[PDB]
Design a protein around this nucleic acid. Structure first.
Ligand SMILES: [Mg+2]
Ligand SMILES: [Mg+2]
Ligand SMILES: [Mg+2]
Ligand SMILES: [Mg+2]
Ligand SMILES: [Mg+2]
Ligand SMILES: [Mg+2]
Ligand SMILES: [Mg+2]
Ligand SMILES: [Mg+2]
Ligand SMILES: [Mg+2]
Ligand SMILES: [Mg+2]
Ligand SMILES: [Mg+2]
Ligand SMILES: [Mg+2]
Ligand SMILES: [Mg+2]
Ligand SMILES: [Mg+2]
Ligand SMILES: [Mg+2]
Ligand SMILES: [Mg+2]
Ligand SMILES: [Mg+2]
Ligand SMILES: [Mg+2]
Ligand SMILES: [Mg+2]
Ligand SMILES: [Mg+2]
Ligand SMILES: [Mg+2]
Ligand SMILES: [Mg+2]
Ligand SMILES: [Zn+2]
Lengths: 38, 160, 196, 249, 119
RNA sequence: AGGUAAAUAAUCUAAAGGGAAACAGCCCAGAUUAAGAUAUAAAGUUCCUAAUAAAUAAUAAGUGAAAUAAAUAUUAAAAU
RNA sequence: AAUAUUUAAAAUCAAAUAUAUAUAUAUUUGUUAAUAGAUAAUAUACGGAUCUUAAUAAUAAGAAUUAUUUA
RNA sequence: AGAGUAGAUAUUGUAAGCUAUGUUUGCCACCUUCGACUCAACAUUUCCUCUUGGUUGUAAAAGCUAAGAAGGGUU
RNA sequence: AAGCUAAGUUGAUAAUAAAUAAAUAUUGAAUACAUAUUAAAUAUGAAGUUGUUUUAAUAAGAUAAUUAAUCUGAUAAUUUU
């Protein structure tokens, strides 16, 4: 997980999710693309 | 001239029921309503120098309305004086410990005026999570109201 | 909306009823609310199971062609519309389970990686590289069977419950990337890394 | 025939609902508690002496806890008292010493005027012993573990060196008039006050002390004593509770 | 800023209503001034007070300041004014180039209707 | 910079009273002595605390509720 | 539905006022929100309580927030 | 931007941009003692211990980096 | 010698349990896909939290006795646990 203020989806296989009052970006292909909005 | 007469009934401490299951007010609004009663602002004979407020029995307090996510967010604080002893409990935790009646009492305490009579006023509030309570028999009642109530229920209440 | 509008086909053996609950409960959001009153049931050959559902939703049972429909009192209400697509899908899943039955194959991959039915079906013992023994009890409704030691099958009427159980079983050892090695639920895949 | 009474509609027409159970109830607390499944007995710490294990040859210091007229006076129950416990009484006392009220209580419970009374809390109703019975050292098995409560030796008004193991100031190198003192007792203004529980000189000892998992070395009903491995809090002739160890089985 | 001038950045509802009322009062004052002048001029020409009040053609004020006040482009009425200009002054050093009117000193007396065209 | 230097206005200085939780300088308003019926100012009107009812929108974050924290990010919403 | 901007009453339209007046001219007004970003040391700190609504069911509650208003 | 055998975002992150802190060196002028010993209390921006995400740069083992975490400990 | 002591001796680092954090899932719409839910349902998850354990305080409750030839205390004496 890259925890950061900015949370953009990198590849096409990335998908944005809204859980626990935080924007997560998970990804099905590349595991490096996992991000979390703060 | 207006003051002269028998004042015993005016200064009589009545007992006021409130079935929280029936009442549609939220917690804080209910507490505010109670506070006035406890003070005795409702009655025209009131004076700031004299405690002349009524008893308030709250019942079925488990069914009290709380808006938003306050039941799992709202934190009740406490502190002895020794540092590193701040005790913060969420509303649900407080309920689990004591009850919804405790929560109501806290609200009512905060509503009340901060002086030597405050404690007395708080004491007069009698809260109950469920239905059954000892003060059942002493809530204000009238003979004209009796036709509304069925026959055996009254007897059962009296027995209780 | 697009999901909820799709009509559900029923075979004579299965019956989709609906009726009010004994003690309806109300889900209270911040602004909106949602009162769970009705209780749909899907009785069939393999078993029977139910869905507790809001008041605004209601079925529309047709005698001709075995179709039934589901509709809400206000489709323009967002929460209702969201519920509608869910409920229909749930009752379809139930129908599928009662008539055919839901299935979940777990294939174990690794040297000495295998499952075993320990308590006459009631406890799936799983051995997946651990000194301590691992496993968990099968829930009610779920029936487990092991064609091979390294290939377990979970079977049930509830699609939710079976696949949850499968996921739990997997969680002891999910597939590693370096060697495709672990517990694979149904058609599960993994991109194997280069060895180097 | 019937008495006059009015009843409010609001209290009569109120739908009946039971209150939810609260954590700060007695019954919840009882459920939570970590308790022994069996009663205990009061004893007196008579002294201390060596126990030689005859197989191995190992020596162990053992305290001799004497068991005299130990008797289940009465017991308490959840429905009446909020918890299960056995009120045990130890020893024999004169009439002269015992209060009239206490004598009457003992007569009611049908025991001799007792030297020391104490409760022994248990998990269940099964743990209660029938009242009036005599508890002997054979109650406990040899090799079993027991928890041991008693009031410690009184040490009097002690300093922070003896109380809290404070290092104190140096013996030489200029140190003036404060060799055994606690040094600083706070902080300049921020707090502006010595904060509660600041370790200071005060009275020490003469407080209760539970000692957990002590092994029952030896039991004999002939001399009326339980041998117990190691130390026990308090002076000689001090009363000592003994119950099964909750931690060790 | 150790001294605490605890003034809120925005106004309450009641404050806003009072401001509105004040604005309305100044417009009323202006109207009265123009009206009285008109009446006086009618009297000079030779009408009674009632006749002057009735008159279809109302006389506009000849003095400059009054005439400017009458113009809504220069001095707008409360009903004419924007929501923003009732409750927000122009302040070039503020972010947004805007500041609450309540932050102006003596705002209860001092009038300020017109802000710049795009600020 | 609660800094420094002057320009204009006000207050404090030398100004009590109401408001701004508490407050030299802010918002009102100038105590000759009382009285307390009527108009009120600024500020307020669930309770503490003197006094409230409505309308139409928006928020669900306790955001906020008298001391507004930025670039940027995400999710919506309108208009083209 | 998709792509890409803008978040605007300058223009434009709508509504209102004032001059000849069923029209013209001039003036005035009307164009997003939420969350994250967010953060230290005696103790929660809107001044405090507390405020976000709910049919069945009340001679009865339903912001006490923000914005535009009324009495 | 640029390093990272290839790929800016595993790890690294020039100069310029937007903030927080009041831990340093200053500035202001309302206001006229460093270290050691002793006992420490509090914070968390976590050094160790517990849980977890990422790591063509996680095979293993050692690491690196990030999220939760102040219970205990930290010559 | 007693006592007091640590260089000595003995014990404890307080479980089981409950709800959680980051994180990991199930079914599943809104949004024909997808999505662990900032939807309804359903699960995992920490030396942390609640507790548990220990000490001190308090005294709801409980047993008994109730104007006393020896009711309950105190003053007094001999003392130390
Ligand atoms: Mg020394
Ligand atoms: Mg000396
Ligand atoms: Mg000092
Ligand atoms: Mg002077
Ligand atoms: Mg003057
Ligand atoms: Mg003054
Ligand atoms: Mg004067
Ligand atoms: Mg707030
Ligand atoms: Mg603030
Ligand atoms: Mg224009
Ligand atoms: Mg704080
Ligand atoms: Mg306030
Ligand atoms: Mg390059
Ligand atoms: Mg740089
Ligand atoms: Mg941290
Ligand atoms: Mg490794
Ligand atoms: Mg703990
Ligand atoms: Mg040792
Ligand atoms: Mg432990
Ligand atoms: Mg789907
Ligand atoms: Mg999925
Ligand atoms: Mg744990
Ligand atoms: Zn991706």
């Amino acid at each position: 997980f890259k925890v950061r203020t900015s949370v953009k989806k990198f590849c096409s296989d990335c998908y944005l999710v809204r859980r626990k009052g935080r924007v997560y970006i998970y990804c099905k292909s590349n595991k490096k693309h996992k991000q979390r909005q703060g | 001239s207006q003051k002269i007469g028998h004042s015993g009934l005016a200064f009589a401490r009545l007992w006021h029921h409130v079935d929280v299951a029936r009442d549609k007010r939220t917690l804080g609004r209910l507490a505010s309503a109670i506070a006035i009663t406890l003070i005795g602002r409702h009655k025209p004979v009131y004076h700031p120098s004299q405690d002349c407020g009524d008893y308030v029995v709250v019942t079925n307090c488990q069914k009290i309305r709380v808006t938003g996510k306050k039941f799992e967010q709202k934190t009740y604080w406490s502190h002895s004086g020794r540092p590193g002893q701040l005790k913060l409990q969420t509303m649900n935790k407080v309920v689990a410990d004591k009850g919804f009646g405790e929560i109501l009492k806290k609200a009512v305490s905060g509503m009340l005026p901060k002086n030597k009579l405050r404690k007395q006023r708080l004491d007069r509030l009698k809260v109950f999570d469920g239905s059954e309570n000892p003060y059942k028999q002493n809530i204000t009642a009238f003979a004209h109201e009796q036709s509304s109530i069925p026959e055996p229920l009254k007897e059962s209440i009296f027995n209780q | 909306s697009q999901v909820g509008s799709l009509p559900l086909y029923i075979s004579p053996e299965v019956q989709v009823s609906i009726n009010a609950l004994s003690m309806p409960r109300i889900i209270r959001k911040g602004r909106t609310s949602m009162n769970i009153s009705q209780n749909i049931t899907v009785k069939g050959p393999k078993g029977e199971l139910s869905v507790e559902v809001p008041d605004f939703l209601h079925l529309d049972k047709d005698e001709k062609h075995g179709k039934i429909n589901v509709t809400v009192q206000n489709s323009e209400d967002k929460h209702q519309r969201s519920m509608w697509g869910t409920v229909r899908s749930l009752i379809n899943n139930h129908i599928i389970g009662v008539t055919e039955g839901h299935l979940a194959v777990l294939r174990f991959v690794g040297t000495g990686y295998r499952a075993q039915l320990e308590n006459d079906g009631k406890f799936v013992n799983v051995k997946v590289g651990a000194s301590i023994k691992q496993g968990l009890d099968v829930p009610e409704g779920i029936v487990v069977k092991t064609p091979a030691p390294t290939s377990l099958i979970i079977e049930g009427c509830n699609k939710q419950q079976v696949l949850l159980f499968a996921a739990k079983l997997r969680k002891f050892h999910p597939p590693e990337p370096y060697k495709g090695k672990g517990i694979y639920v149904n058609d599960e895949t993994i991109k194997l890394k280069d060895k180097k | 025939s019937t008495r006059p009474f009015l009843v409010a509609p609001s209290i009569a027409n109120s739908i009946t609902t039971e209150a939810p159970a609260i954590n700060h109830s007695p019954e919840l607390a009882n459920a939570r508690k970590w308790l022994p499944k069996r009663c205990g007995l009061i004893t007196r710490k008579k002294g201390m002496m060596p126990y030689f294990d005859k197989s191995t040859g190992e020596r162990s210091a053992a305290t001799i806890l004497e068991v005299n007229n130990v008797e289940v006076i009465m017991h308490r129950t959840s429905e009446v008292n909020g918890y299960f416990a056995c009120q045990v009484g130890y020893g024999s006392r004169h009439l002269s010493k015992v209060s009239r009220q206490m004598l009457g209580h003992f007569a009611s419970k049908v025991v001799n005027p007792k030297e020391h009374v104490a409760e022994f809390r248990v998990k269940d109703e099964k743990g209660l012993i029938p009242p009036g019975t005599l508890l002997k050292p054979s109650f406990f098995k040899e090799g079993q573990y027991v928890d041991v409560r008693s009031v410690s030796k009184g040490k009097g008004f002690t300093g922070v060196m003896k109380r809290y193991g404070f290092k104190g100031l140096r013996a030489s190198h200029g140190t003036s008039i404060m060799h055994r003192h606690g040094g600083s007792y706070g902080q300049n203004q921020d707090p502006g006050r010595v904060l509660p529980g600041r370790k200071m000189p005060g009275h020490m000892g003469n407080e209760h002390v539970t000692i957990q998992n002590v092994k029952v070395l030896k039991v004999d009903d002939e001399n009326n004593v339980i041998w117990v491995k190691g130390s026990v809090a308090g002076p000689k002739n001090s009363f000592v509770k003994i119950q099964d160890a909750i931690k060790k089985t | 800023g150790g001294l605490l001038w605890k003034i809120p950045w925005r106004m309450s509802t009641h404050q806003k209503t009072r401001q509105r009322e004040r604005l309305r009062n100044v417009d009323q004052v202006i109207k009265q001034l123009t009206l009285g002048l008109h009446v006086q001029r009618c009297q000079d020409k030779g009408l009674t007070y009632q006749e002057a009040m009735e008159s279809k053609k109302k006389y506009k004020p000849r003095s400059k300041s009054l005439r400017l006040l009458n113009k809504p482009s220069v001095f707008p009425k409360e009903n004419q004014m924007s929501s923003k200009d009732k409750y927000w002054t122009f302040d070039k050093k503020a972010v947004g180039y805007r500041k609450g009117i309540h932050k102006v000193p003596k705002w209860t007396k001092i009038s300020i209707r017109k802000a710049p065209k795009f600020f």
